[PDB]
């Protein structure tokens, strides 16, 4: 269009060459990945299940881009943006399965498993509390396989030493506690003083569909209105969108296989 002020979109989710404040990203240098890409923790810990068809639920998202942005600002945008999508899906799926956060559509989660079986330890981090937490699993004939922790509490873990052997129970180089690997969750929901453990082989997941992508220059986007309230038409408004979608399924074979340590 011939609009010389940029188009206001609602929500303001469309990528634009000209910001609202009048900044123009010409000659724009490609950003650099200041943080390493995150990975799905339940795909790391849990047991894969060969699954054809389906109980699965779909994950999806669409990223619209103004084709001025795609021409002048950042030509390769859609290829560089695929990992950051898959990261978003991994984070969503982890947050659902583990913490029962983000509208997890399953009836199944570790957070619910723990809250059901009441397998929770109230206390500060101490060697005795780590041993009691692990014993909450071995009570039911299940042995802990790994730990899930907020990385911000390594400052607490370094302060615990075995008073018999008189050495650090936490190997800060291996990032392993009592010999078991600790995986870190970046999500904001797991507080500083909280630690989770279980026999993750009992947590089963399946992927009836790998991430599809489709990139399109023609569809209508009813969920993104123009300033005047008409839906965006990508072809008329000279615009492009990427769609990504995935199906995933989650199962907890034995909800007593998980225990949680939390501050008193």
């Amino acid at each position: 269009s011939n609009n010389v002020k940029p188009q206001v979109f609602n929500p303001d989710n469309v990528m634009m060459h000209e910001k609202k404040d009048g900044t123009l990203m010409n000659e724009f240098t490609t950003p650099i990945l200041q943080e390493v890409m995150e990975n799905s923790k339940i795909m790391q810990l849990g047991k894969y299940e060969p699954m054809e068809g389906t109980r699965a639920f779909k994950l999806g998202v669409i990223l619209p881009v103004t084709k001025e942005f795609l021409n002048y600002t950042y030509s390769q945008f859609f290829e560089e943006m695929k990992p950051m999508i898959a990261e978003a899906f991994y984070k969503k799926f982890d947050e659902a399965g583990i913490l029962n956060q983000g509208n997890n559509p399953f009836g199944k989660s570790i957070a619910q498993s723990i809250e059901k079986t009441n397998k929770v330890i109230k206390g500060d981090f101490t060697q005795d509390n780590i041993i009691d937490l692990e014993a909450l699993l071995e009570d039911d004939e299940l042995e802990a396989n790994a730990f899930i922790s907020k990385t911000q509490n390594r400052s607490l873990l370094r302060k615990i030493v075995d008073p018999e052997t008189k050495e650090r129970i936490y190997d800060r180089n291996s990032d392993s506690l009592d010999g078991l690997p600790v995986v870190n969750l970046k999500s904001s929901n797991l507080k500083r003083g909280e630690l989770i453990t279980g026999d993750f082989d009992k947590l089963i997941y399946g992927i009836p569909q790998l991430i599809e992508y489709k990139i399109d220059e023609t569809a209508q986007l009813s969920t993104v209105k123009n300033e005047d309230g008409t839906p965006v038409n990508l072809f008329e408004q000279d615009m492009v969108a990427l769609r990504a979608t995935m199906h995933v399924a989650l199962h907890i074979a034995d909800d007593k296989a998980f225990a949680k340590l939390v501050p008193a």
Partner: protein, 466 residues
């Protein structure tokens, strides 16, 4: 284009600090190499392939062309294929010959070459070298108990080398997007094969769990060689392909030609321009093609005080025009530079000398010969590894005496220059050559029966005795 071909993480060589065992026990490391290949190297190879197929940027970059009543005239010239086919045919159009001092080794080599149709195989490798800059070949002991040689596609194969200055090849990988034809759901499942010095490990993977490698059915499969079976070949020490450096000129020539095609499509060649205040009946204008006289009668303006004056009528043809001199000099410069930087003969500015074709050709291909001799060195360096593998499998099967050595083989290269059998015969029989009658006859195609003619000569030579 640019951001894929000239990027820094494309075109690198993978290296690993540990031994084969240190790699194989930590299979995830191979997952990182596969990921790096997909993200950085494959794009480059894909672009080079698209240019060989002629899918140049100008065809696919619809992003600008306006979807109106106007025509597109998007054009692709195929310089990439013209160049690669010429350079490859010059290098390997004439089969490599083999010489050895020991006939047992020579006949074992010739048997393997004939069984595997190595002539065609070698040419296909030369072509891959020419487009991608590098090529891979896989050797396997078949189920029918035969040594087979197959080319491995460049977009799906790579090698991880020892980090020492010697850079021995530690492990090779091949991975493919196996898909059915009907659907596009789980096609991001890649079947991975990892080749070590002692066997193949077979896996399944997909991009979207992050390429965790998992054992396929019957995952490990031993092989009787004693070194990793895949071999890599190079076009030059940079592993860069013959048109990669001129893709930008091919792009410019596409743009210029499709620009002129638009100018031709969109402007009218000529029109009859008629000016001035006049009445034109659109029914009468249809006679324009067949009228002989055009009569323009100007409007007469009457002033209130009685003055009279005439309007200014006018008429004449007008025709579109463009800067032919500057655009043809520019397109000629692009074409000349594309051929100059690739040492390919510029057919548009060429004259033949006399009759002897080979010497004019060595003059014109002198520049191309210089690059080919380097490529000849690197090609023989690869052929020697192919022979090393063949000798190893033959000895382990005791199909040959352990006493034999294959490194004595001499690989003799001939260029595919044009030749003149009549002048060569005259040069061979002068200076003392000899030829058997049946052989001599086989060279000339006017003999309808090259063998029967001998009997027919004996009859004449017999009746001449009486």
């Amino acid at each position: 284009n640019i951001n894929y071909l000239f990027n820094d993480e494309a075109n690198v060589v993978y290296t690993y600090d540990g031994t084969e065992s240190d790699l194989l026990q930590n299979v995830n490391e191979v997952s990182k190499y596969i990921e790096h290949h997909m993200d950085y190297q494959r794009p480059r190879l894909k672009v080079l392939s698209d240019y060989y197929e002629g899918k140049t940027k100008n065809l696919v970059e619809l992003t600008r062309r306006k979807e109106e009543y106007m025509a597109d005239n998007r054009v692709a010239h195929d310089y990439a294929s013209y160049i690669s086919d010429f350079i490859n045919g010059y290098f390997l159009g004439n089969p490599i010959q083999y010489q050895d001092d020991d006939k047992d080794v020579l006949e074992a080599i010739e048997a393997f070459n004939d069984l595997n149709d190595v002539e065609s195989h070698n040419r296909s490798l030369g072509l891959d070298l020419s487009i991608y800059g590098k090529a891979y070949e896989l050797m396997i002991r078949n189920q029918d108990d035969e040594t087979r040689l197959y080319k491995s596609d460049a977009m799906s194969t790579f090698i991880i080398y020892d980090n020492t200055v010697e850079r021995n090849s530690i492990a090779g990988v091949r991975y493919l997007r196996t898909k059915p034809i009907d659907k596009t759901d789980e096609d991001e499942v890649f079947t991975v094969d990892l080749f070590t010095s002692h066997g193949v490990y077979r896996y399944l993977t997909n991009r979207t769990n992050g390429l965790k490698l998992t054992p396929r059915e019957n995952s490990f499969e031993s092989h009787s060689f004693e070194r990793m079976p895949i071999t890599e070949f190079s076009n030059n020490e940079r592993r860069k392909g013959d048109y990669e450096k001129v893709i930008t000129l091919i792009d410019l020539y596409d743009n210029a030609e499709s620009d002129t095609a638009n100018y031709m499509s969109d402007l009218n060649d000529a029109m009859l321009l008629i000016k001035g205040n006049l009445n034109l009946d659109p029914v009468e204008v249809r006679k324009q093609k067949e009228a002989n006289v055009l009569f323009l009668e100007p409007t007469v303006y009457v002033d209130a005080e009685g003055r009279e004056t005439e309007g200014s009528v006018d008429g004449g043809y007008i025709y579109k025009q463009y800067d032919v001199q500057g655009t043809e000099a520019y397109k000629d410069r692009l074409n000349s530079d594309i051929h100059m930087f690739t040492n390919t003969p510029n057919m548009k500015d060429d004259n033949f000398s006399g009759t002897q074709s080979g010497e004019a050709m060595k003059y014109k291909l002198f520049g191309l010969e210089q690059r080919t001799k380097t490529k000849e060195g690197l090609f023989t360096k690869g052929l020697r590894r192919r022979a090393k593998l063949l000798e190893t499998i033959l000895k382990n099967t005791r199909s040959i005496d352990a006493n034999k050595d294959f490194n004595t083989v001499r690989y003799v290269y001939n260029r595919n220059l044009p030749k003149s059998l009549i002048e060569e015969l005259k040069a061979y029989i002068d200076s003392g050559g000899k030829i058997s009658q049946t052989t001599l006859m086989s060279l000339f195609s006017f003999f309808q029966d090259p063998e029967l003619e001998v009997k027919k000569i004996e009859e004449d030579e017999k009746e001449s005795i009486k």
